[PDB]
Structure 1
Amino acid sequence: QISVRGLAGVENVTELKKNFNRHLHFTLVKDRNVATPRDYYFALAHTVRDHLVGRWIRTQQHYYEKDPKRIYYLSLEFYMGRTLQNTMVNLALENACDEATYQLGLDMEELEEIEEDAGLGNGGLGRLAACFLDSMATLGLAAYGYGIRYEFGIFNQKICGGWQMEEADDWLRYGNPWEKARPEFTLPVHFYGRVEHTSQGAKWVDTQVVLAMPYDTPVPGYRNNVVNTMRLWSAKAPNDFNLGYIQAVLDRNLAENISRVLYPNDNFFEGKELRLKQEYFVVAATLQDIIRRFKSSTNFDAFPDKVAIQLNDTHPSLAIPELMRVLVDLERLDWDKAWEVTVKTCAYTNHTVLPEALERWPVHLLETLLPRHLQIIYEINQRFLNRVAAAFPGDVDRLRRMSLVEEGAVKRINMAHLCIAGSHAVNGVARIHSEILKKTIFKDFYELEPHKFQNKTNGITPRRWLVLCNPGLAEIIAERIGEEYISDLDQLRKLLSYVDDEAFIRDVAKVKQENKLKFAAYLEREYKVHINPNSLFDVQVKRIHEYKRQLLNCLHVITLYNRIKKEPNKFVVPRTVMIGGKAAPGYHMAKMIIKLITAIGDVVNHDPVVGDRLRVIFLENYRVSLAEKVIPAADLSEQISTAGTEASGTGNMKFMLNGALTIGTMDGANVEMAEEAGEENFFIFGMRVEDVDRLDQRGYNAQEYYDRIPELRQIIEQLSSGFFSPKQPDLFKDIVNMLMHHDRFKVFADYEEYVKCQERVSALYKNPREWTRMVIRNIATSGKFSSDRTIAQYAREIWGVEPSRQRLPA
């Protein structure tokens, strides 16, 4: 049908049809009389998977023969989403499969909707890991993703009476055709026990054993015949575990609980023992696998020449003391040599500066669970502080600030300090964030070892986030500049030559309009909600958090409502304001924000004076599959975190690539997006980082803004008085109290500038030709935000390997 989806040759289509019928009969054990749409989805998935296998085997054979340096990306989260369409895109099978299924009387898009998201992450950090895997395969790197196979991923969100309810995400219920269990590479992981010191070094004894069983998932590169591996570990009890009899068998669940469920926090740390077990479990199994693969090519001097370990935040930070344990206790290397190898092997990426997100584990937990690792951590600390004292003699306060061990009521280990000490490279995830790291929280470390500190601005894969989710846009671009941009996104700059082209302007606006109609129809059928598809689609989708300031958006929505009610017969640009995202189950204020958003919708959407001029919709169960639908439909992207809080953002980049304009603060990657597009082509507002600092120095007083801005005072009085909660008048008093007295994120301080900037958005939307010209300038300059660029920088500047765009044989 469309060119970027590849060829539908008669021979390919015939073969796909034959294998589909083979899998329906032999694999699923159905005939066409009893088969459901789900059976048809599975038959297609097995058909497509068969095309990966030869390439997967050949890729792994190739790495064995060439023995390149191997890159191990360790993460507690991989937010993969669906795999069927992405696999077809990367193997150039999409049109052939569409034709094959059409000839069998089936609609492939309907079959795609059956697949569950692999929701093994919370949001941006887990999704970044998924984009990175895609880019590493596309760049021909010998890369392995290692994590945990959670039985239950991020919870499914239901809204009941306007409140979030959580339900278990039983994503494996129908089976996962993409994974292959490898019970033959099962490895032991140790917990508890105690340390004995013999004359032959330290020995960790009397431990409890849990088995780590790997499941492998293929990761195809873009049309290069490279298929890399994501290896996820699942916890299994040994067979003599606890071995009255019946209870001993039932108690196997205690060991197997390690891989049961993803902790559903975003930017928040809880010191729970089960989470620490998860972190060690991934690290211990992974490092044994790495070492086994290294030995099958003891001279550990070459280890950092053949192995790079990238730590995705501090979550796998125990890799540092585990690597030391193995090298010193088991391989019998002297400490100094082991440390040299460790530092050269490991690199650490930081993803947040919020103090409540930083992992600081109580010493008593580590002492009980991982007594040998605690001893190694203390020794690391003592040697590290000896270096600090030599470089800054007499600076006693610096020693306290830089210690891996934090003193207090409860002694804790600062895992970020451990990662810096034990890594040859430390990076932030956008330029402003990397600078903030060097100037504030890691300033002392930067002064000691400036060479370690780098920036690697985040990116997104253009396969999933353009070609897959927005084929209409991909096609009209390809008609002008060919297909090479899909793996070389900088080529989108060529579109600046079409900014005055009437045909291109029309085609860009036509694609957006089609995407909006499609999304409006999706809403009506799956959620019984009607929207005006001529309205401006104003979209804020991301996890619910005070720092992301969904509350600032709520204040703007109420402002627009109140202005309409004041002058009902004045023209205003119609908007559909859509907000979605999950709240962590224990985060009360985040749950209250969801309730406020739905309560505003309840009033606004049923006021006959408003008409279809303003609609407020809470998008339920925001996840990767929903992002693929709503992002192509958006006109305005809301990226409105308080300056200094969003380390990068990646949703921002997805919206830019898909033809939305951005309203945002100078935070995270927004800064770089504005720099690339030109500030004139971005809706920038609000305090910069320096302005936030100045306000903190004199003290933030929310009352001053309340006193000076009548429109703001009216909103607070409405919230307090029960205007949005007539049955429960005090329902929102905690929100009001936080905004007035305890607001860490300064919502009121950016209110005036935000509202004025929103008026400019509305003014531009009235002139569709100029709106679309600005859009073209954004899409055209989005090339920097390809994860292929990000990964090439990690490869050259951290890992010491060269990317390749060369194809392996087919």
Structure 2
Amino acid sequence: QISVRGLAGVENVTELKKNFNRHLHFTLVKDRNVATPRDYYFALAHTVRDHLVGRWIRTQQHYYEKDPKRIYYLSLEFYMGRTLQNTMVNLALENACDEATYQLGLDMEELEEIEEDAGLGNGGLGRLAACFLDSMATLGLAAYGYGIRYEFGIFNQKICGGWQMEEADDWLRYGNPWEKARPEFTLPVHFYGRVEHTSQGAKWVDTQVVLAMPYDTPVPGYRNNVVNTMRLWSAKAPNDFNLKDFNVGGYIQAVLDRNLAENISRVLYPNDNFFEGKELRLKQEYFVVAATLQDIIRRFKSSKFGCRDPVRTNFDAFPDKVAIQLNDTHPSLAIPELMRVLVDLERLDWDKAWEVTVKTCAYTNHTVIPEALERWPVHLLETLLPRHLQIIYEINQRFLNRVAAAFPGDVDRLRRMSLVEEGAVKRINMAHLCIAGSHAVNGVARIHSEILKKTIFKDFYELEPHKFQNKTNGITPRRWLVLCNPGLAEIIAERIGEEYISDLDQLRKLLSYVDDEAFIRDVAKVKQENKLKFAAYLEREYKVHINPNSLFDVQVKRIHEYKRQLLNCLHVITLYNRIKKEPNKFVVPRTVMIGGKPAPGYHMAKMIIKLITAIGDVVNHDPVVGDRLRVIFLENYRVSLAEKVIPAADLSEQISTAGTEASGTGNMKFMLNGALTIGTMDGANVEMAEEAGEENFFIFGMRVEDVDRLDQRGYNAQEYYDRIPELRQIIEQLSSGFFSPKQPDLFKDIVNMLMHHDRFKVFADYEEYVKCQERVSALYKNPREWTRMVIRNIATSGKFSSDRTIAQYAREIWGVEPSRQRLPAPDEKIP
């Protein structure tokens, strides 16, 4: 066998080679003698896409005949990655396409590397939305993902001289085989304008019009013939006023200025956990909300209502036919917008319209760090969206009256709960708009949802306890096991079968093989094969050598002070310093690989990439160190690079200050792929250690209590400097130019910060972190017992499947039951 990537059947390997040669000639208009690997990749992309249009068309007509409650997942980010392999996995096409291209004389693997990632996300948030869409289609949900088809996704990172250089991601330069533009369904979105209060309504008048044109991408569930839809809006100028708001300027200039309306979907904002209050961002937020709500209401007005049902467009059943989920506060304008359409256009009374709005909306909060929070200045909302500010003031008015009635006399509560923040500039607090206008609010890991109830939304929890929930994040076992680690999925499937791919709790059955000797050597063999293949990819695409027999220590995630790549840096420098001190003493060899992108304006995260490259500069060229220690910055980290490094890791760094990483999902990916975790009791590390047992994890540090104790006291970093010689030695190395010789003051900003303004108190966890790291090296030395802990982690990772998450969203927030029932075939059909 190759692996169990499906059957390579006789009629179907021949079917696929026929269609591959059809598309190269008819679609690509190339012949075999001028086709490059890229043309061969497109011939394949088109042949696999033909296998899901049958199922797409019949999944959509099915939701039309039966009319289930529809789930609208609204996100400004969807981080899909590449879609050829994933689509072959979900349709069971992967071995038939492997044989078929083999017979055509091509390497499928070589062609899969040609696909550009769809990079429409920054990281965690965007990828949670792509893992969610996979699980909704796998669980038979009538679900729709909605977002912006950005033409430039997250920048490609280049390192020049150790510094990040950002360059535009032109992911569409060659085309996207997977979208279907739907210009028939373009919709108008209004901006600026003013409100006339006339007789039987307010009206929004003298608005600028932008057209939202849809592009649909298919989302296939795993082996069940459901193919749901991701619809992504693109901005288009009208050809009228963007031209005929006549009377000199210039004709050519009017046409060139069209790219003013079309700039709304041009580029993703490259910030992860940081709010920039730019007008273009708010235009992006209103545009995906306005266009999506029109499409939603349009579908509901057909339903079985636009036939009969009671007969009246009674929006009373709108919540029993519509669930819209808000992915963070970025689509929060869906609350005042659903109100506007219903009061202003459909003419419902306010209070009916408000009951229908809270009953269909639900809000997911993703972080508690204050600079991530949206607080949009009122003059901005006032200019651009004047009806919506009025609706926000009226919602506020009425909500604070409920607070006043329940907490009579508590005047500080009222100022603390207001959706309107007074101050220098007044602002609207979008998270407050979202708790007031949603029937459910949830965090993303059990400790983060407890921190919401206890600290940041405590007033809101005391008011309406029944709204706050938890739904711990997950990861999809299809890309994150079966696709990136087929060998591990194989050796698992040999022992327990293939039903675990859509039932990840079945992995508990591996616990019976924790003492099976053939299993332990197999598990250790695929990890070694992954390490060898990544070690190779590295000299191929990017390198000057590494050693596959070392511990692969990796921390790959966005560069932030709260995720503390700096604490990892302090640990690498220690290791170096100890082996400069005792050169001929044995130490377990490590390749520590750190990678991630910094948002362009985040000066400290840019300085941290520069420190990591400066350490590898020194460490990787010291001869006394030899191959005992290598430090590597993993360039342009993205979804496809994660599918290559996470199978190859031995140790996962999940080192954020307790209370700052709300969940994390990279931690989950590493746990089902055979890495052991070194982490703090933060986010979902706590539920993972509870699932594997704390003995099967390396936890260290401060807990949330201890962080708050320290903050009661006052964190003084000099106390640590003064008491720990190894820590002291490192800072004066940074401070004197040991690591930056030509530019000795270069790192003074990291030193000054760590010493005087460290928000994430890197020094407080340093002692217990280098002690915990001594413990993992000790165990790496006992291969057999490292692999049995690995086994304890894999067999215990099934809780962290996004199928478990989506089934709890479905039941406890959406009111819909998941299915795992194969939809009636693909079978051809024309009606």
TM class by shorter chain equals: over 0.9
For the 8 Å contact 2:212–2:236, the answer to whether it is kept is yes
Give per-residue Cα distances to partners, 1:292-330, cap 9 Å, x unaligned: 000011110000000000000000000000000000000
| 1:44 is aligned to 2:44 | yes
How far did residue 240 of structure 1 move? Answer: 1.2
For the 8 Å contact 2:56–2:226, the answer to whether it is kept is yes
User: Can you give the 5+ residue segments of structure 2 that lack an aligned partner in the other structure?
Assistant: 244-249, 304-312, 826-831
CA distance in 2, matches of 1:49, 1:472: 26
How far did residue 529 of structure 1 move? Answer: 2.2
For the 8 Å contact 1:74–1:312, the answer to whether it is kept is yes
| 1:296 is aligned to 2:311 | no
Aligned residue number for residue 360 of structure 1: 375
How far did residue 232 of structure 1 move? Answer: 0.1
Aligned residue number for residue 821 of structure 2: 806
CA distance in 2, matches of 1:489, 1:357: 33
Give per-residue Cα distances to partners, 1:749-802, cap 9 Å, x unaligned: 000000000000000000000000000000000000000000000000000000
**1:8-23 alignment runs, 5 A limit:** 8-23=8-23
Q: SS of the residue aligned with 2:210?
A: strand
Give per-residue Cα distances to partners, 1:517-555, cap 9 Å, x unaligned: 000000001112200000000000000000000000000
How far did residue 748 of structure 1 move? Answer: 0.1
Give per-residue Cα distances to partners, 1:667-706, cap 9 Å, x unaligned: 0000000000000000000000000000000100000000
Aligned residue number for residue 401 of structure 1: 416
Aligned residue number for residue 438 of structure 1: 453
Q: SS of the residue aligned with 1:410?
A: coil
CA distance in 1, matches of 2:240, 2:36: 42
How far did residue 640 of structure 1 move? Answer: 0.2
| 1:529 is aligned to 2:544 | yes
Specify which of 443, 451, 465 is matched with residue 450 of structure 1.
465
Q: SS of the residue aligned with 2:260?
A: helix
CA distance in 2, matches of 1:735, 1:366: 38
Normalized against structure 2, the TM-score is what? 0.97
Kindly report the root-mean-square deviation, in angstroms, between the aligned alpha carbons of the 2 structures.
0.4
Q: SS of the residue aligned with 2:821?
A: coil
Normalized against structure 1, the TM-score is what? 1.00
CA distance in 1, matches of 2:3, 2:35: 32
User: Can you give the 5+ residue segments of structure 1 that lack an aligned partner in the other structure?
Assistant: none
How far did residue 4 of structure 1 move? Answer: 2.2
Q: SS of the residue aligned with 2:630?
A: strand
CA distance in 2, matches of 1:356, 1:585: 16
Q: SS of the residue aligned with 2:295?
A: helix
CA distance in 1, matches of 2:677, 2:543: 29
Give per-residue Cα distances to partners, 1:330-352, cap 9 Å, x unaligned: 00000000000000000000000
How far did residue 2 of structure 1 move? Answer: 3.1
Aligned residue number for residue 284 of structure 2: 278
**1:205-354 alignment runs, 5 A limit:** 205-243=205-243, 244-297=250-303, 298-354=313-369
CA distance in 1, matches of 2:801, 2:624: 45
| 1:391 is aligned to 2:388 | no
How far did residue 809 of structure 1 move? Answer: 1.4
For the 8 Å contact 1:188–1:210, the answer to whether it is kept is yes
Give per-residue Cα distances to partners, 1:374-427, cap 9 Å, x unaligned: 000000000000000000000000000000000001000000000000000000
How far did residue 579 of structure 1 move? Answer: 0.2
Specify which of 508, 513, 521 is matched with residue 498 of structure 1.
513
How far did residue 174 of structure 1 move? Answer: 0.1
For the 8 Å contact 1:241–1:252, the answer to whether it is kept is no
How far did residue 200 of structure 1 move? Answer: 1.6
CA distance in 1, matches of 2:602, 2:529: 38
For the 8 Å contact 2:476–2:801, the answer to whether it is kept is yes
Worse-matched range after superposition: 755-764 or 2-11? 2-11
| 1:712 is aligned to 2:727 | yes
CA distance in 1, matches of 2:194, 2:726: 64
**1:674-693 alignment runs, 5 A limit:** 674-693=689-708
CA distance in 2, matches of 1:683, 1:36: 48
How far did residue 3 of structure 1 move? Answer: 4.2
Give per-residue Cα distances to partners, 1:608-644, cap 9 Å, x unaligned: 0000000000000000000000000000000000000
For the 8 Å contact 2:131–2:476, the answer to whether it is kept is yes
Give per-residue Cα distances to partners, 1:196-243, cap 9 Å, x unaligned: 000021000000000000000000000000000000000000011332
For the 8 Å contact 2:3–2:487, the answer to whether it is kept is no
Q: How many percent of aligned residue pairs carry the same amino acid?
A: 100
For the 8 Å contact 2:591–2:631, the answer to whether it is kept is yes
For the 8 Å contact 1:122–1:264, the answer to whether it is kept is yes
For the 8 Å contact 1:2–1:475, the answer to whether it is kept is no
> Hey, which bits of structure 1, 4+ residues long, moved more than 2 A?
1-4
Aligned residue number for residue 154 of structure 1: 154
CA distance in 1, matches of 2:424, 2:644: 49
CA distance in 2, matches of 1:438, 1:571: 49
How far did residue 104 of structure 1 move? Answer: 0.3
CA distance in 2, matches of 1:409, 1:431: 36
CA distance in 2, matches of 1:208, 1:679: 58
Give per-residue Cα distances to partners, 1:434-489, cap 9 Å, x unaligned: 00000000000000000000000000000000000000000000000000000000
Q: SS of the residue aligned with 1:193?
A: strand
Q: SS of the residue aligned with 2:46?
A: helix
Aligned residue number for residue 168 of structure 1: 168
Q: SS of the residue aligned with 1:314?
A: coil
For the 8 Å contact 1:241–1:248, the answer to whether it is kept is no
| 1:471 is aligned to 2:477 | no
- Count the aligned residue pairs: 810
CA distance in 2, matches of 1:264, 1:334: 41
Q: SS of the residue aligned with 1:29?
A: coil
Give per-residue Cα distances to partners, 1:595-618, cap 9 Å, x unaligned: 000000000000000000000000
CA distance in 1, matches of 2:719, 2:754: 12
Give per-residue Cα distances to partners, 1:261-314, cap 9 Å, x unaligned: 000000000100000000000000000000000001111000000000000000
Give per-residue Cα distances to partners, 1:725-755, cap 9 Å, x unaligned: 0000000000000000000000000000000
CA distance in 2, matches of 1:417, 1:637: 36
